[PDB]
C-alpha cells in the first residue's frame, strides 16, 4: 500500500523544530564563542567539541526550512535543486555530528587509561567531514521534488529508479542503521565498557569489608558476653587483612586498624568485656578517619562514571527511535512486513523519531562543555 501520511497528527512538528532550533541555537552559539574566544590553545579534547557543536549548529541551521515541509503537508516550496541541497547537507551534518560523538567517547576512554598536545586532530577532524560527504552523495543524487501520487502535493523525496525503488529505498535504510547507529554505538558503548573495566581495576571494592567493621562494632557496642566480643573482633581482623591488599598512605590506616583489633582481641581472650568495648571505642576513630578518606576518593570515581553513562544514554535516547523505524521501514521495503496498520504508523512516527535525532544536537553541549563550568 501507500498511506496519506498527512493528518491532524503532524500538526505538532512545525513548532517543536522551532523550540529545538532556538534552544539548540543559543546553547550551541555559547559552545563556539568559548572555543572561538580563547581557543584550546592546541587542546585535542576541546577541538572535537567544536567540530561537533559546529556540525550540530548546521543541522539546527536548516530546521526552520524543514518546518515548512511539515507545515505545508509535504509541499516543498523551494524547487527541485534546493531540495537536493538541504537534504544532502542535513544527512552530511547528522552523520558528522554522530561520528564526532564517536571520537569524543574514544578520546574520553584514552583520557582515563593514559591521563596525559594536539597532532592527529589533523586527520581525525577532516577525515570525519570527508566521509560525512562521501556518505551524503547517495542522498544528493536521489533527492528530488515529485508531485506525490496520493497527496496531490509536490514533495521533496528520495527518488530512486521506479523499476527497483523497493531495493534501493531498503539497502539505503540499512546503510543508515550500520553507518549511523550499529557501528558508532560499538565504538561509544565499549568505551563505557573500558571506563567501567579501568575504574574497577584502578580501585578496590572495600565496602564488603567496611560493612563488617561497621556491623561488628555495633555488636561490640551492645555486647553481653566475652564470646560475642571475641567473635565480632576475629571477623573485623580478616576484614582489615583483605582491605590491606586493595601516592596514598591509606595502607598504614589498616596497619593501625589491625594493631587496634589484635589488642582488643587480647582483652576479649582474657574475658574483659568493658575493656574490649572501650578498646573498640578507639577503633571507631581509626575507621572514621579512613572511611571518610575513602568516600572523597570514590566521589571522584563517581562523577567520572556518571558522565561516561550520560553520554551513551543521550545517544541511545535520541538515535534508537529513528534507527528502529528505519529498520522496519527497510524490512517493509524488502517485503518482510505487509500489514498497513504498521506502515500507517511507521510513516506517522518517523517525523518525531527524526526530531529526536536533532534534540541530541541540542544536548551534546550540556554533556561535553557545560559540565565542569
Amino acid at each position: 500500500c501507500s498511506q496519506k501520511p498527512s493528518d491532524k497528527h503532524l500538526d505538532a512538528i512545525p513548532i517543536l523544530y522551532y523550540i529545538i532550533f532556538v534552544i539548540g541555537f543559543l546553547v550551541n552559539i555559547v559552545v563556539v564563542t568559548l572555543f572561538c574566544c580563547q581557543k584550546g590553545p592546541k587542546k585535542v579534547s576541546s577541538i572535537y567539541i567544536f567540530n561537533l557543536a559546529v556540525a550540530d549548529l548546521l543541522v539546527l541551521a536548516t530546521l526552520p526550512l524543514w518546518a515548512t515541509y511539515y507545515s505545508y503537508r509535504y509541499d516543498w516550496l523551494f524547487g527541485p535543486v534546493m531540495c537536493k541541497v538541504f537534504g544532502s547537507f542535513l544527512t552530511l551534518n547528522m552523520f558528522a555530528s554522530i561520528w564526532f560523538i564517536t571520537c569524543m567517547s574514544v578520546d574520553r576512554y584514552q583520557s582515563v587509561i593514559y591521563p596525559f598536545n594536539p597532532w592527529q586532530a589533523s586527520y581525525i577532524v577532516p577525515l570525519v567531514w570527508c566521509m560525512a560527504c562521501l556518505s551524503s552523495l547517495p542522498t544528493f543524487y536521489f533527492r528530488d521534488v515529485r508531485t506525490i501520487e496520493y497527496l496531490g502535493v509536490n514533495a521533496c523525496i528520495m527518488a530512486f529508479p521506479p523499476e527497483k525503488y523497493a531495493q534501493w529505498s531498503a539497502g539505503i535504510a540499512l546503510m543508515k542503521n550500520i553507518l549511523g547507529f550499529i557501528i558508532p554505538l560499538i565504538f561509544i558503548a565499549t568505551c563505557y565498557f573500558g571506563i567501567r573495566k579501568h575504574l574497577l581495576k584502578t580501585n578496590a571494592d572495600l565496602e564488603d569489608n567496611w560493612e563488617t567493621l561497621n556491623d561488628n562494632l555495633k555488636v561490640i557496642e551492645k555486647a553481653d558476653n566475652a564470646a560475642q566480643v571475641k567473635d565480632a573482633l576475629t571477623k573485623m581482623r580478616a576484614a582489615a587483612l583483605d582491605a590491606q591488599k586493595a601516592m596514598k598512605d591509606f595502607r598504614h590506616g589498616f596497619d593501625i586498624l589491625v594493631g587496634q583489633i589484635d589488642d582488643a582481641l587480647k582483652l576479649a581472650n582474657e574475658g574483659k568485656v568493658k575493656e574490649a568495648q572501650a578498646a573498640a571505642e578507639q577503633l571507631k576513630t581509626t575507621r572514621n578517619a579512613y572511611i571518610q578518606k575513602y568516600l572523597k576518593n570514590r566521589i571522584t570515581r563517581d562523577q567520572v562514571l556518571k558522565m561516561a553513562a550520560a553520554v551513551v544514554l543521550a545517544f541511545i535516547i535520541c538515535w534508537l527511535p529513528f534507527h528502529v523505524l528505519t529498520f522496519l521501514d527497510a524490512l517493509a521495503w524488502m517485503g518482510v512486513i505487509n500489514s498497513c496498520e504498521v506502515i500507517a504508523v511507521i510513516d506517522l512516527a518517523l517525523p518525531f523519531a527524526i526530531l529526536l535525532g536533532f534534540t541530541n544536537s541540542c544536548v551534546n553541549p550540556f554533556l561535553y562543555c557545560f559540565v565542569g563550568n
Binding site: 501507500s2 542535513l90 515529485r146 514533495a155 528520495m158 529505498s169 539505503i172 527524526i354
Partner: peptide, 8 residues
Amino acid sequence: GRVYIHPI
C-alpha cells in the same frame, strides 16, 4: 509503491 518522504 510509497516513496521515502521524510527529511532523512
